[PDB]
Amino acid sequence: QADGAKIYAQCAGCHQQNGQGIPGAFPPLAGHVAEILAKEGGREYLILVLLYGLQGQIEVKGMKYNGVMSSFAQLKDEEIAAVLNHIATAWGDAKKVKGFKPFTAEEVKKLRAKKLTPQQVLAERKKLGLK
Numbered sequence: 001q002a003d004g005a006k007i008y009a010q011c012a013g014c015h016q017q018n019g020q021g022i023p024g025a026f027p028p029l030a031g032h033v034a035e036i037l038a039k040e041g042g043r044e045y046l047i048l049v050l051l052y053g054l055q056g057q058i059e060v061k062g063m064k065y066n067g068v069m070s071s072f073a074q075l076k077d078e079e080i081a082a083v084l085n086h087i088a089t090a091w092g093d094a095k096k097v098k099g100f101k102p103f104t105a106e107e108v109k110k111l112r113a114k115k116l117t118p119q120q121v122l123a124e125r126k127k128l129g130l131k
């Protein structure tokens with residue numbers, strides 16, 4: 001099973017069907033996912049956000065966000081890999097990532113041992129050296 005586009009319905013009210021988010025509220029995923037994936041540790045980070053959530057001040061496309069995102073750990077590993085592959089391809093980000101590797105259920109499964117808080121996920125983000 002696992003249809004990333006269908007699972008994305010759970011994210012769309014915030015990040016939007018076009019992945020552009022809402023400045024001042026929910027960050028964009030379109031365009032931005034490629035930027036994260038280009039960093040070493042970027043794909044793991046995206047999985048951590050889905051498993052553990054995120055909170056804290058971040059900047060995305062030169063705009064500031066200081067909100068909270070819940071964890072989606074209740075989703076199956078296949079579902080998380082599917083929705084992450086969806087946000088990586090729905091708006092063309094994958095083509096923009098040299099050597100893009102699709103997320104897999106096993107990768108997600110492995111990171112379930114981490115047991116992080118949203119603050120630890122922010123600490124992981126800071127190590128990517130984004131903006």
Ligand code: HEM
Pocket residue numbers: 007008010011012013014015025026027029046049054055056057058059060065066067068069070072083084087125
């Ligand atoms: C749905 C399963 C869903 C996905 C997918 C998703 C992804 C996502 C990513 C990858 C980030 C990190 C962006 C970054 O620059 O680090 C992120 C961040 C936030 N999200 Fe999200 N998100 C999904 C669902 C939801 C839902 C339902 C909401 C709105 C209630 C939401 C909100 C946010 C917010 C806010 C952030 C930023 C958190 C911060 O520290 O400011 N997401 N999301």
